[PDB]
């Protein structure tokens, strides 16, 4: 079923969708800090592998708002609740790795 490959490219596009959903997943949840798992799950429920993957890619694009701190007891998420999601919107737009990766 080449329907599969269709789904593959489609998801490749849904990266951006995820940015937009995560961005503002924070914002329509007037918190901007959080339990990474939680929102990960809500946005997940919108559409886990894909989910965590997005968690990663966003971290990479925006290693400013986001920090991941492994502590004894585990890796704690760090999230800058004051980061600017518009700038972050355009930045997410431009750096998909410029969609070159």
């Amino acid at each position: 079923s080449q329907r599969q490959k269709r789904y593959q490219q489609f998801l490749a596009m849904k990266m951006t969708q995820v940015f937009d959903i995560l961005f503002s997943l924070t914002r329509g949840q007037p918190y901007t800090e959080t339990y990474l798992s939680s929102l990960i799950v809500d946005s997940l429920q919108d559409s886990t592998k894909e989910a965590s993957e997005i968690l990663a890619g966003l971290q990479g694009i925006l290693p400013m708002d986001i920090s991941v701190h492994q502590v004894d007891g585990g890796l704690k998420v760090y999230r800058w609740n004051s980061l600017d999601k518009n700038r972050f919107s355009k930045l997410l737009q431009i750096h998909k790795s410029k969609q070159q990766d």
Partner: protein
């Protein structure tokens, strides 16, 4: 003749019940949950017209928090008061409340802290939008009730959310979406499937199959008459346990909408006033 109710929707996130905090009070919120124990709709005041005959009555306002009393101030006049009452049933704003005590979603439950239900009152046309024993999403309107107060969320937007563009399943699935497309490519596995159901059991296969299929479809819908029932009821008779279904059923514990009703002595609390019986297994086996 002026009554307006405004309902936002399409909020970006979803909050867990336990996730609730006192910081979020008085701001709208997002919660989905399992409905329990609905209550009959009862009229409200919104604004009530109550005042004394001295000198003028049925000033229209408040009783806002459940009190329900009373006329607050500038009584009577000129009997200025205090006094009390008098309420015009001629003039006030009824509403609603059906209220409901909803439970947190089952799957979520962190071990072992166990579920905690909360109550929410259905005001406005969102009333009755609810169904008991149902996963449903709501807009927070959260706030509080005295008790000393106890927070109780409220609901503007009642969504029963919780098929398909099988794509949008794939799109939804997307990450594996690569992986098991192979499975679609793959074959025989009707065996391997069959070769997977109740690993517990030696043989017992015709069953293992049967369960599998039972999980499968067969379509609602005629419109002549009966929407053709897709569902299939399976009976398995046997010499007693040692696996009875003492095995098979328990195994079948692993599944969606999955209702393991131990014994038939309940007595039909199943369908009590959730079909413990049934409405919970809707699109699932009890």
């Amino acid at each position: 003749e002026r009554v307006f109710q405004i309902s936002f929707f399409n909020l970006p996130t979803v909050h867990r019940i336990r996730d609730i905090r006192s910081e979020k009070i008085g701001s709208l919120l997002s919660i989905s949950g399992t409905v329990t124990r609905t209550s009959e709709v009862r009229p409200e005041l919104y604004k009530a017209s109550f005042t004394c005959d001295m000198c003028r009555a049925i000033v229209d306002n408040v009783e806002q928090s459940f009190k329900y009393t009373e006329p607050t101030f500038c009584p009577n006049p000129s009997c200025e008061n205090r006094a009390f009452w008098t309420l015009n049933v001629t003039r006030s704003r009824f509403l609603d409340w059906q209220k409901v005590r909803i439970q947190e979603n089952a799957n979520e439950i962190p071990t072992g802290s166990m579920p905690r239900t909360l109550d929410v009152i259905l005001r406005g046309d969102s009333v009755e939008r609810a169904k008991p024993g149902d996963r449903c999403k709501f807009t927070g309107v959260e706030i509080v009730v005295p008790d000393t107060y106890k927070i109780s969320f409220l609901a503007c937007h009642v969504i029963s959310i919780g098929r398909d563009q099988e794509v949008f399943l794939n799109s939804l699935s997307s990450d594996e979406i690569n992986e098991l497309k192979e499975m679609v490519k793959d074959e025989h596995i009707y065996d391997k499937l069959v070769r997977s159901i109740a690993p517990a059991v030696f043989g017992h296969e015709a069953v293992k199959k049967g369960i599998l299929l039972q999980m499968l479809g067969g379509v609602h819908k005629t419109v002549e008459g009966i929407k053709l029932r897709g569902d299939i009821n399976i009976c398995v008779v046997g010499d007693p346990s040692t696996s009875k279904s003492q095995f098979l059923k328990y195994v079948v514990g692993f599944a969606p909408r999955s209702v393991y009703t131990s014994g038939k002595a309940s007595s039909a609390a199943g369908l009590t006033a959730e079909a413990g019986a049934l409405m919970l297994a809707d699109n699932g086996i009890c």
